[PDB]
Ligand binder design. Structure first.
Ligand SMILES: Cc1ccc([C@@H]2N[C@@H](C)[C@@H](O)[C@H]2O)cc1
Length: 438
């Protein structure tokens, strides 16, 4: 036991209603929108292959010159009601929005910096319009916030001098000012998802990360805070020096997921994965031919994979500079929504089922002991193997969409073949099991 002032504050999962809501939502969308959408990964005739939102770094653009992109910020096709409609039709239950990325441009009219939407031709409070429109559709809003800020010359990557320490202290005050402003201007916010907290400067000021968590929790009742914000007294991140999760949920599975056999430890805490459609582009990049682009079924597999292991999944969108979505993203959101409309009873408010993983897909468990089989890989044998935990038996199987009864055959003690449906559903599909405990 290492004594810590700024280590973990929760013991186990939060079970207050706000955390239950964060969890039951399960499926979210991410929006990365900022000045990087304007060049879209290209600078002065070179298209950079790195993530578009990092183009300032790839093209070595000085801050003043990068931030002059504000003069081009005029997304005339933006309509927050249309964005909220697209999210609703996709089946998302919440949206995480970049309030400010590393570049430091704010999507709300901050009084603490001139680098904001207010000082662009468009003028309007994008973040405020989104909060209202998403909330009008019943969709929760979460705020992404980058602590690292390339627009503020008080930022420091490490503290190597008295002057660095004074500057970084001013930087933390500026950061607190913005965070309090977000929390009070948009009091329906349900979560702060911090990024840009990996530098030595933040690791040496773990106390500040704990402070920011506590400050936001006092301002916004029931607010969630991600693990990535948090460093302990020793500079240890996400999990403290005693191995305890800091913040309210683990937020490290970013473009990767826990193994369904080897990583069952994740079922012990809340967690949220986020993923990009291309291999590694969050902000708008004009050239999606540069890396592999996931198909809708690949995305749906990841969504179900997360819920099957007790986690949420957030699918990223990088809107165009004009305020509309690219056709690949409109197609993705539509295809996800069509699937979720049909099969979402096996996703929303579901969790880890405690069954041995099988090759056909994933199990999820509903709030009333329903066990859903979500089938992604159709066996040529036309039999879906179900091995039940000790004392659990399968009483019935039903095809979710039609309610048709599915034959269940016991093959050995604790093992069944559940028949595939008489007609191949032609897409990933759900069979609902009625199970009984000894
Ligand atoms: C190494 C690395 C740094 C920052 C990131 C940022 N976090 C993602 C959620 C995006 O915002 C990406 O810019 C990703 C990888």
């Amino acid at each position: 036991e290492i004594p810590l002032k700024y280590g973990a504050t929760n013991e186990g999962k939060r079970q207050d209603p706000a955390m239950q809501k964060f969890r039951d939502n399960r499926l979210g969308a991410f929006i990365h929108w900022g000045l990087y959408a304007i060049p879209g990964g290209e600078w002065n005739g070179k298209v950079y292959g790195g993530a578009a939102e990092w183009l300032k770094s790839w093209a070595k653009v000085p801050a003043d010159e990068w931030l002059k992109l504000m003069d081009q910020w005029n997304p005339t096709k933006f309509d927050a009601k249309k964005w909220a409609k697209m999210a609703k039709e996709m089946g998302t239950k919440y949206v995480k929005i970049t309030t400010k990325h590393h570049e430091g441009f704010c999507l709300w009219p901050s009084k603490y910096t001139k680098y904001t939407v207010a000082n662009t031709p468009y003028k309007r409070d994008i973040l405020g319009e989104l909060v209202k429109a998403y909330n009008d559709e019943g969709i929760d809003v979460h705020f992404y916030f980058s602590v690292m800020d390339w627009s503020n010359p008080d930022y420091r990557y490490d503290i190597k001098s008295k002057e660095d320490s004074i500057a970084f202290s001013r930087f933390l005050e500026f950061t607190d000012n913005q965070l309090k402003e977000l929390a009070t201007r948009y009091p329906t916010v349900k979560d702060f998802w911090f990024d840009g907290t990996w530098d030595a400067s933040v690791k040496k000021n773990g106390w500040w990360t704990a402070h920011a968590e506590q400050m936001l929790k006092e301002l916004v009742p029931g607010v969630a805070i991600n693990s990535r914000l948090r460093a302990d007294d020793k500079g240890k991140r996400h999990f403290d020096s005693n191995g305890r999760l800091m913040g309210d949920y683990e937020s490290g599975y970013e473009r990767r997921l826990p193994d369904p056999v080897k990583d069952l430890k994740v079922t012990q805490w809340d967690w949220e994965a986020c993923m990009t459609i291309p291999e590694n582009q969050w902000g708008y990049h004009k050239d999606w031919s540069l890396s592999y682009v996931k198909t809708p079924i690949e995305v749906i597999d990841r969504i179900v994979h997360a819920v099957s292991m007790g986690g949420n999944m957030v699918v990223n969108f990088g809107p165009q500079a004009d305020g509309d979505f690219r056709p690949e993203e409109k197609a993705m959101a539509t295809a996800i929504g069509k699937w979720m409309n049909r099969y979402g009873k096996a996703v929303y408010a579901c969790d880890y089922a405690g069954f041995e993983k099988q090759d056909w897909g994933y199990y999820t468990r509903g709030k009333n002991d329903e066990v859903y089989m979500v089938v992604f890989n159709q066996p040529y044998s036309e039999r879906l193997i179900v091995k039940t935990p000790k004392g659990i038996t399968v009483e019935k199987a039903t095809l979710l969409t039609t309610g048709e009864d599915i034959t269940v055959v016991e093959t050995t003690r604790n093992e069944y073949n559940v028949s595939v449906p008489k007609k191949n559903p032609g897409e990933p599909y759900v069979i609902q099991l009625k199970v009984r405990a000894a």
